[PDB]
């Protein structure tokens, strides 16, 4: 057993009835001194290292060619001047096992944390040395963490795409289904997760060219997609992961849900495809009143009205569909369907829940389209337009797919440095650069939507960590007050940066004029309401930082009306799992699952205490399974009111909880304005 691993395992060995938390610093120091320094390649100078990395097909020479070697040396010195030290063994282990560049044989280490940070900053700056230094300071201070794809692949010749989340609309035709399979395989080949909307596919038993009962429904396409994702499993290094979304009013909803039953037959069972359900307010209203509900055949609706069922307003068109003899529908029990969803989530954690009306009542780009589904992580909520892929030698009608490149603010580090504005603006710049340099040449809708909408996702992490290290309970009203103020500030500064970018480039996103930003309806609550902390304790946390007021929001509204917005979507809180160890932070805005994380790496078990965990803050590091999910919903709803996209919201359930408790949590989240529910985790 490695010496550092033995030191780490001493964490759990109680001394004086207390965990030996100081053993992790010794564990990380031993890990470095005994493995990392030994296995780190030696280079006489930075010039030689850069030459070796470029010539040996490790780095892309184009982005490094925009700087004189003096500027590159200055940036690397800026990264190294901080003398950054990993506070725990797990942070350094995760970095040097996942993100640190290694020789082609995976035997030696070519990049340190400073080297990766400097390369990422130089890639972001796009030839600006001062901007590169600012990015280096942001990342080395760990105020901002680029998403795993960007952090790992930026500046590397043999790299996947820096965007890893894609949403695909599928039209009701064989050409569209085949193109969807091809695009999913192409995108999974790039390492990105693919979410597909299957609500426009006709249900099982529908006619194909005036021949009845010919359609296999969404389950056959689901089997096709599951096999496609299994085949394009990223060369075996990471199994292909895809998500399928179906509106609850789709006739195949019960068959769609049954694909995740354990007892499901292997023919119908889908193994590697995640499933989410889009629930309009109409379904919740029907279930609340216990009224018999109907699920519709999409193709009958399309023929009767000329539009897709998910392209129409269900809250208004449900009665018309029920009263239309030319629309085929199946009677269902809405409460039985809700209970089936709860039981399926308890057994497997699926499906994801998207509350469509919660998403679209605040959606700023409803003129472009309503939000119909989410991504594989359930935090992407953007307008999409379905593409029409025609026969060979015909012209395809390319629509708008969804993709956003992610980055996370480190809430603890941002608050400690009092740099919400600067961090948010720099992260927005880096995400804009990543979006601009991204070009998928096998997903026409994805490429077109990336060019037209310029969507980015700026997330946050270490909310529970920051609160616990400041003596604030995650479920307390003070925690919600802090989240309200912090995310209001984040939204304000991201909007300001988007407007500044639009002014500098003299260009907004496609169809901005019809958005709520253009009309000013977006800023109504910000100009009419105040979001400064209501608790003196929280207000003190923001000392030295300007909290935007109603006057500031009015000025920002006027500025946006004058100059517009560059990004259709800016903020989305993704789960941010792997890089949380490197950042030494709690994942996303969710509460911690366990105070100390027990992991197995090889035959050695590693112990990871929650970042900042200690005797004096043990009580504030309350585990998620012990919290009231209603309070977690309150926190997420407080945060979600300042996020234009969704928040990846996992539910942490105890094994004693019945399906009724899960249903109550779902209904409260829908009541509280929650947009999506990611996972039902049971302890």
């Amino acid at each position: 057993v490695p010496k550092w691993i033995q030191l780490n395992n001493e964490i759990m060995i109680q001394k004086d009835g207390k965990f030996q938390f100081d053993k992790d610093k010794e564990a990380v120091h031993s890990y470095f001194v005994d493995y990392i320094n030994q296995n780190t390649v030696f280079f006489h100078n930075l010039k030689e290292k850069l030459d070796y990395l470029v010539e040996n097909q490790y780095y892309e020479e184009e982005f490094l060619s925009l700087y004189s070697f003096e500027d590159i040396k200055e940036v690397f010195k800026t990264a190294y001047a901080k003398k950054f030290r990993f506070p725990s063994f797990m942070s350094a282990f995760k970095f040097y096992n996942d993100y640190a560049l290694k020789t082609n044989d995976k035997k030696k280490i070519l990049e340190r944390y400073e080297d990766r940070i400097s390369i990422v900053a130089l890639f972001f700056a796009n030839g600006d040395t001062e901007k590169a230094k600012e990015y280096v300071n942001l990342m080395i201070n760990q105020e901002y963490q680029p998403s795993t794809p960007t952090f790992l692949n930026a500046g590397r010749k043999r790299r996947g795409e820096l965007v890893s989340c894609f949403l695909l609309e599928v039209n009701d035709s064989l050409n569209d289904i085949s193109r969807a399979i091809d695009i999913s395989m192409q995108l999974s080949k790039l390492g990105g997760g693919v979410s597909l909307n299957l609500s426009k596919l006709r249900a099982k038993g529908e006619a194909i060219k005036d021949v009845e009962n010919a359609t296999k429904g969404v389950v056959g396409v689901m089997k096709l997609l599951d096999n496609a994702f299994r085949y394009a499993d990223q060369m075996g290094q990471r199994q292909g992961s895809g998500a399928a979304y179906l509106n609850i009013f789709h006739r195949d909803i019960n068959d769609f849900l049954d694909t995740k039953k354990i007892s499901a037959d292997e023919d119908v069972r889908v193994k590697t495809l995640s499933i989410g359900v889009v629930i309009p307010d109409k379904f919740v209203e029907l279930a609340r009143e216990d009224k018999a509900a109907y699920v519709f055949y999409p193709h009958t609706i399309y023929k009767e009205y000329g539009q897709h069922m998910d392209e129409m307003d269900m809250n208004e068109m449900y009665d018309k569909f029920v009263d239309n003899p030319r629309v085929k529908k199946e009677k269902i029990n809405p409460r039985k369907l809700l209970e089936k969803l709860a039981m399926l989530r308890s057994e497997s954690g699926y499906p994801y829940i998207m509350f469509q009306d919660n998403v679209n009542k605040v959606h700023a780009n409803n003129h472009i389209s309503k939000v119909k589904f989410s991504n594989l992580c359930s935090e992407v909520l953007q307008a999409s337009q379905v593409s029409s892929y025609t026969d060979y030698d015909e012209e395809d009608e390319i629509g708008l797919d969804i993709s956003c490149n992610l980055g996370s603010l480190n809430i603890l580090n941002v608050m400690e440095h009092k740099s919400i504005e600067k961090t948010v603006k720099l992260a927005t710049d880096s995400l804009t650069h990543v979006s601009e340099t991204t070009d998928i040449r096998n997903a026409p809708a994805v490429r077109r939507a990336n060019k037209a909408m310029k969507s980015i996702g700026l997330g946050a992490m270490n909310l529970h960590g920051y609160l616990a290290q400041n003596g604030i309970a995650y479920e307390s009203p003070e925690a919600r007050d802090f989240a309200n103020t912090f995310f209001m500030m984040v939204n304000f500064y991201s909007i300001q940066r988007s407007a500044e970018i639009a002014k500098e480039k003299g260009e907004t996103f496609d169809q901005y004029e019809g958005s709520t930003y253009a009309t000013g309806e977006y800023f109504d609550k910000y100009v009419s309401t105040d979001f400064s902390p209501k608790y003196e304790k929280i207000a003190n946390l923001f000392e030295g930082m300007h909290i935007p007021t109603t006057e500031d929001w009015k000025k920002l509204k006027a500025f946006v009306a004058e100059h517009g917005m560059y990004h259709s979507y800016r903020l989305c809180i993704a789960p941010t799992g792997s890089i949380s160890y490197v950042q030494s932070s709690t994942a996303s805005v969710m509460p911690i699952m366990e105070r100390i994380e027990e992991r197995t790496y090889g035959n050695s078990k590693t112990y990871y205490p929650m970042p900042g965990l200690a005797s004096n803050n043990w009580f504030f590091y309350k585990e998620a399974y012990d919290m009231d999910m209603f309070k977690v919903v309150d926190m997420i709803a407080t945060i979600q009111q300042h996020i234009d996209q969704g928040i990846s919201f996992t539910l942490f359930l105890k094994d004693t909880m019945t399906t009724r408790d899960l249903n109550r949590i779902d209904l409260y989240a829908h009541h509280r304005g929650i947009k999506t529910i990611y996972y039902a985790r049971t302890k």
Binding site: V284, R288, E339, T659, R660, H671
Partner: protein
């Protein structure tokens, strides 16, 4: 926690003697020396004789005293494999390799052999001592059964596996490998039934049952060493066979939830090559 899983594994391993054509073994059998042919015959007869006891007494007696319909069904299936499949398979191998008179003589010899008889009668003695509604006597018999399935057969299995790993007597070696694969799962299953009884006992009674198991293992092991030298010295293999016996003794102990008795040893590479729904109440929708 385990019977339905073992049911599945047992029934999916079903096979019949007729599936393997045996005649092509004569093309390697003719090239073995007299000592090799003699050892093979004697080993084969040893396995045959022990497996007959397991089919006629061992499995049916355990099935009789174990409570539970599903356990009785699995045990019945195992007894069937002994009597209907394994016994016919051993007979088929014999009839292929030796003429009738040679088979009768080998069985006469092995029937009189001191080391084969000692172990056969020790095991049978414990099966005969099971008393109705006495779980202690049942446990002792289960220990004996696990020792036969997971340990005593292996001084015998060694030789067919040794040939099988060299490309000799491949058809009969394939048959033996299928038999051995059945005995392995039989040993694991009966082992779990024994642990169930063991876990129902007091700490003093447990210590007493452990002493019984180790004492029995020791008696059988010392006789196995003699059995081994008696058969394998003439073909120079006894040292390696002894390592294989100890390795399989450790597996038998682990089947009974006990610690290994013998230090870990490497095995001959030729032999290795051979081897809660609740309904919504109309108030959950209001907050």
């Amino acid at each position: 926690d385990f019977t339905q899983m073992f049911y599945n594994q047992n029934v999916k391993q079903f096979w019949l003697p007729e599936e393997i054509a045996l005649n092509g073994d004569l093309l390697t059998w003719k090239y073995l020396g007299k000592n090799e042919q003699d050892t093979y015959m004697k080993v084969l007869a040893g396995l045959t004789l022990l497996d007959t006891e397991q089919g006629n007494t061992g499995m049916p007696i355990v099935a009789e005293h174990v409570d539970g319909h599903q356990r009785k069904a699995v045990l019945n299936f195992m007894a069937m494999m002994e009597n209907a499949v394994h016994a016919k398979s051993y007979s088929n191998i014999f009839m292929t390799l030796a003429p009738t008179e040679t088979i009768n003589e080998v069985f006469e010899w092995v029937k009189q052999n001191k080391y084969l008889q000692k172990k056969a009668q020790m095991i049978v003695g414990l099966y005969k001592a099971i008393q109705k509604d006495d779980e202690i006597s049942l446990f002792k018999a289960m220990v004996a059964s696990v020792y036969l399935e997971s340990f005593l057969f292996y001084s015998g299995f060694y030789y067919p596996l040794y040939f099988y790993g060299q490309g000799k007597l491949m058809q009969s070696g394939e048959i033996i490998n299928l038999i051995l694969r059945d005995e392995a799962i039989h040993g694991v299953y009966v082992g779990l039934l024994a642990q169930e009884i063991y876990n129902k006992q007091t700490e003093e009674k447990k210590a007493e049952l452990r002493e019984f198991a180790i004492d029995l293992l020791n008696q059988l092991y010392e006789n196995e060493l003699e059995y081994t030298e008696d058969l394998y010295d003439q073909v120079g293999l006894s040292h390696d066979v002894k390592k294989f016996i100890r390795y399989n003794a450790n597996k038998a102990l682990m089947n009974l939830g006990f610690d290994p008795y013998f230090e870990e040893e490497d095995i001959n590479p030729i032999v290795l090559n051979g081897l809660t729904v609740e309904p919504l109440k109309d108030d959950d929708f209001y907050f």
